[PDB]
Amino acid sequence: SCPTHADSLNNLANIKREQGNIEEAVRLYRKALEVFPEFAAAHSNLASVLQQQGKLQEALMHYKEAIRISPTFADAYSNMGNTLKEMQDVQGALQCYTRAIQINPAFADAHSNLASIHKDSGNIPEAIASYRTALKLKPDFPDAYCNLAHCLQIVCDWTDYDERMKKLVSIVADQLEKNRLPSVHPHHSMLYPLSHGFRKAIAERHGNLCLDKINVLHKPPYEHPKDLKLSDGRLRVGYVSSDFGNHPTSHLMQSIPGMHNPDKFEVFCYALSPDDGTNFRVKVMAEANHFIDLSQIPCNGKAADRIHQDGIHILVNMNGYTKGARNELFALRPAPIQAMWLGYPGTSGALFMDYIITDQETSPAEVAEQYSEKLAYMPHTFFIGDHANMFPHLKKKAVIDFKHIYDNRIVLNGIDLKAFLDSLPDVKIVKMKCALNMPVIPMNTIAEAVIEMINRGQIQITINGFSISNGLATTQINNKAATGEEVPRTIIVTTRSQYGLPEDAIVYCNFNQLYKIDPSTLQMWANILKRVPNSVLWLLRFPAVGEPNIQQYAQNMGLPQNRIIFSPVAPKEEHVRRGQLADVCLDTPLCNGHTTGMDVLWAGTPMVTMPGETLASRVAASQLTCLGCLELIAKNRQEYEDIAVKLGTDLEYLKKVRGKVWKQRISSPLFNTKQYTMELERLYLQMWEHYAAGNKPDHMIK
Amino acid sequence: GPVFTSRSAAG
Ligand SMILES: CC(=O)N[C@@H]1[C@@H](O)[C@H](O)[C@@H](CO)S[C@@H]1OP(=O)(O)OP(=O)(O)OC[C@H]1O[C@@H](n2ccc(=O)[nH]c2=O)[C@H](O)[C@@H]1O
Q1: Could you tell me which residues come within 8 angstroms of residue A120 by beta carbon, excluding any fewer than 6 positions away?
Q2: Radius of gyration of the CA atoms of chain A, in A
Q3: By C-alpha distance, which of A97, A100, A110 is closest to A144?
Q4: How is its activity regulated (chain A)?
Q5: Do A371 and A230 have their domain in common?
Q6: Can you list the pairs that A684-691 forms with residues at least 24 positions away whose Cβ atoms lie under 8 Å?
Q7: CATH number for the domain including A185?
Q8: Any residues with CB less than 8 A from the CB of A66 and at least 6 apart, and which?
Q9: Whether residue A200 sits in one domain with residue A224
Q10: Out of B1, B3, B8, whose CB is closest to A187?
């Protein structure tokens, strides 16, 4: 019955949590609650560690209790909220946060938590509002400050940018030393000027967050195979992803499982997400030797066992710290070898991950410092894309003449393009020198009927019985094709006039999310635009609220509205296809276009880059050197501007480079998934031979 | 239509 006894028990548990010894802390709290059952603070503390243990089920019940005892406990409401969120019950969580703020208007944390819900839903201005509220209520609040910082980044509010940055670094630096969990998310750490030392250290900590959740399960280490004997001479590779579906990851690697060689490899795909019923999911299920739906084995314990029973040699993590990740699986070390691949563009910083598949250009030897894993190099680039298979209609184009002869003002693509062109009277064939060429339809009645459709905004027309489609309406003609799930079965016209682009101008584009732009990147582009008098920059409303903001910072650098053009975001296929309309693509040096990189390159649109120091800023370079276009890679800001300007001012040079990209996307290794798969296989075998000979993981540079 | 981006984890 004694609260004085119970009280000191609580103090003693609070001490075990300081020393990190969690399992003892729990025992004490439980006694404290057995001595005095109506003890608010204990229920609350016990709850907040059970939450840490991933025992959300029970943790919630104790929070409820604390609230029942002591109903003015705004702090418990807020934390109960966090618990509901993690249980996928957003509504319930939200009700808590609001309920708390009502009880204590002046309580900072609940406002911050509320803003975080808003962020997850994509409600950014609403998120900003609430973060700002929280920081007014409590001006030293790292979590809120950093989250705010990321929103501002997301919409390109660069108010006080340099201060902001200095203060972030300063906050992390403190939290790292003070030994707490840093407020900056690892996946974001790449956007700010932290030391590589810091980036790694942040990742470390999130790695450890896993270990806590698995010590609760008390599992013995697993027994890994030492030979390929039970697996019948075949090496067993498991791909683990929450993204077998309509997601970038699948748009890159969906062909790979199918292309593995069955004599030497047995392929297991472990889905962490439910079936969205898209073809991406269908294809992988149909081609992998074994498809396993782990989205229905939510206990990380049984899931790990399952992998271990399947007898996997190499387990590949395609998530890192993205949404859907379940790194607890990897932390349980069910495979002898575990590598990061493709999905997450940074180090995991964690002990349980052995290798990271990358390349010479992305991760040269000197910067080994910044990864916790050991480097495993692919021969060219570690990047890959399914464009060859997804969008073969863009393997060839044709143009309509209206005037000079331009490769990108009115464009036609289609599987049956050749057949249609032969139905036409007067088709001139422009040679592309140094087997290749681009047909040109002259301005007869037919061409006019096509512009007619475009200008009037109609869906489609018929010409000599061929089906001709408006590029903007693909989605209504055939939704599966618009998404990339099918190859289109009609001919598709794509024009600059559709997007309100000047017919007679140099078009620089960037199709990435706006968060990747910073004030230097923009300055740099302003520079280019000024020096290339009759040109525009083409950007996306990604998200839309970022547009007014960029327009502002552009006006401050002396650019009329006219000079930057924003299009809405488009379905995958349209997005890829309309890159054909640009002249050059300027790549964000803070954090490169990754998928976006492949997407412009597939369109045959040269892309200029300046490789930084983080992996995320070095990818476009890597893609380009693999393509074989070393003259599009700048060493510094000055040089980048020069390359861009030369391309805009020298129409002969442009045509040469454009033409060189158009050829090499086929001939280089870059979009060749078969060859890619094979190199990946060679690499796997090296990793295994090494482990089989009884060695610990170490760098692999051929 | 809508987009499918890489989204970050929860912290
Ligand atoms: C920095 C970062 O996180 N990089 C990740 C890589 O490390 C991962 O390996 C990539 C694969 O998992 S995801 C990611 O690569 P990114 O290039 O940053 O792409 P991001 O996540 O912004 O969205 C791109 C999508 O929007 C599509 N997109 C774009 C415009 C449009 O109009 N329509 C459209 O579908 C694009 O075609 C794509 O379909």
Answers
A1: A90, B10
A2: 28
A3: A110
A4: Subject to product inhibition by UDP.
A5: yes
A6: A684/A235, A684/A237, A684/A265, A684/A314, A685/A235, A685/A264, A686/A376, A687/A314, A687/A337, A687/A339, A687/A355, A687/A376, A688/A235, A688/A313, A688/A314, A688/A337, A691/A336, A691/A337
A7: 1.25.40.10
A8: A40, A41, A43, A44, A47, A73, A76
A9: no
A10: B8
Task: Say whether both A529 and A469 belong to one domain.
Answer: no
Please tell me which of the candidates A85, A86, A323 has its beta carbon nearest to residue B7. Answer: A323
Nearest residue to A172 (alpha-carbon basis) of A143, A137, A151, A136: A143
Q: φ, ψ for residue A215 (rounded to 5)?
A: -60, -30
Contacts of B7 in chain A (CB under 8 A): 322-323
Encoded amino acid at A522, one letter = L
Q: Which two tokens stand for residue A440?
A: 């040109």
Amino acid at A499: Y
Q: Do residues A236 and A314 touch, judged by C-beta distance below 8 A? A: yes
Ligand 1 touching residue A697 (CB < 6 A): no
Hey, what are A299's tokens? 């206990």
A187 among known catalytic residues:
yes
State the resolution, in angstroms: 3.2
Residues A373 and A238 in one domain: yes
| Residue A86 at interface with chain B, using a CB cutoff of 8 Å | yes
Tally the domains of chain A. 5
For residues A481 and A488, is the Cβ–Cβ distance under 8 A? yes
Residue A485 and residue A278 in contact, taking contact as beta carbons nearer than 8 Å: yes
Distance in Å, CA A249 to ligand 1 centroid: 9
Residues A340 and A276 placed together within one structural domain of the fold: yes
The technique is X-ray
Which regions of A528-627 does DSSP assign to beta strands (E)? 535-540, 564-567, 584-586, 607-608
Inter-chain CB proximity A322 and B5 less than 8 Å: no
A294 burial type by CB count under 10 A (0-12 exposed, 13-18 middle, 19+ buried): buried
For residue A217, the CA-to-ligand 1 centroid distance in Å is 36
Looking at residue A607, the DSSP 8-state letter turns out to be E
Q: Which helix (H) or strand (E) holds A171?
A: helix A161-177
Asked whether residue A312 falls in the same domain as residue A425, the answer is no
Test B5 with A571 for CB contact under 8 angstroms: no
**Boundary residue ending a domain (A171, A200, A218):** A218
Mark the binding-site residues of A for UDP, compressed into ranges. Answer: 513, 516, 570-572, 575-578, 594-596, 599
**Beta bridge partners of residue A550, listed in sequence order:** none
Find the A555 Cα to ligand 1 centroid distance in Å: 29
Please report residues of A whose CB lies closer than 8 A to that of B10: 85-86, 120, 323
* Cβ contact, residue pair A571, B1, below 8 Å: yes
Range of the domain at A83: 1-107
Q: Please check whether residues A328 and A258 belong to one and the same domain.
A: yes
Q: In ligand 1, which atom is closest to the CA atom of A513? A: 22
Choose the catalytic residue: A43, A187, A247, A387.
Answer: A187
- A553 in Cβ contact with A539 (< 8 Å): no
